Write a protein that binds this ligand. Structure first.
Ligand SMILES: SC[C@H]1SC[C@@H]2Nc3ccccc3N21
Ligand SMILES: [Zn+2]
Ligand SMILES: [Zn+2]
Length: 228
């Protein structure tokens, strides 16, 4: 917890820019483990990146949005099929929110014990989302960097800001380690591809660290170089 953070139930919210917030939820494992996602205000609507670990926690994200922003949530995008990112899908579907994930994330979801998203994103060979599969994503710029943390992991830049979201692919520059589902061969190149896709992002948001500078990307890639 840090100055300027807002506690709402057992969740924490931090404003990162005029129209961007980080949501943080916690699961006991080892102690409490944090997972971060994003909330974006885009005109008269709100966009969400990643659920919380659980449905009840994700419901509280929606309650916080109602109180602090009071705009309808148009869509949510989730960045791979693990519990921290997709554990709360039912809360979104119960609320009528359109949900999006990598097609591979939706294909893996049943095996991972997750509820698949309603819609599937596909990607070009250069990693950029096929625009037809990302309808009305507004400032959310979705990029598939290649296999790393998982084979399905995706990343999201926030257009009009200096923020890019690396999900669980990127760790901060103080991390000592990065891998059960991981592609250790391609991880380093995937980390570097994320950096090259969002070359002007100066605030890197990630799932299990507080926001960091671009050094988080390079430090992560150099740690991943050692896995090969
Ligand atoms: S990246 C998916 C999440 S869900 C359970 C597993 N173990 C773990 C431990 C610490 C941080 C994150 C994690 N992961
Ligand atoms: Zn994961
Ligand atoms: Zn994670």
């Amino acid at each position: 917890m840090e100055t300027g953070d807002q506690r709402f139930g057992d969740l924490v919210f931090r404003q990162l820019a005029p129209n961007v917030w980080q949501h943080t939820s916690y699961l006991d494992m080892f102690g409490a483990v944090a997972s971060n996602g994003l909330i974006v205000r885009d005109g008269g609507r709100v966009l969400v990146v990643d659920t919380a670990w659980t449905d009840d926690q994700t419901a509280q994200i929606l309650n916080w949005i109602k109180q602090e922003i009071n705009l309808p949530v148009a869509l949510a995008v989730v960045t791979h099929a693990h519990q921290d990112k997709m554990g709360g899908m039912d809360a979104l579907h119960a609320a009528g929110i359109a949900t999006y994930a990598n097609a591979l994330s939706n294909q893996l979801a049943p095996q991972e014990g997750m509820v698949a998203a309603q819609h599937s994103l596909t990607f070009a060979a250069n990693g950029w989302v096929e625009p037809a599969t990302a309808p009305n994503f507004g400032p959310l710029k979705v990029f598939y960097p290649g296999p790393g943390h998982t084979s399905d992991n995706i990343t999201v830049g926030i257009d009009g800001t200096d923020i890019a979201f690396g999900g669980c692919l990127i760790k901060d520059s103080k991390a000592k380690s990065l891998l059960g589902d991981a592609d250790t061969e391609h991880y380093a190149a995937s980390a570097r591809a994320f950096g090259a896709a969002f070359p002007k992002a100066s605030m890197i948001v990630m799932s299990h660290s507080a926001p960091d500078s671009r050094a988080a990307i390079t430090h992560t890639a150099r740690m991943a170089d050692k896995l090969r």
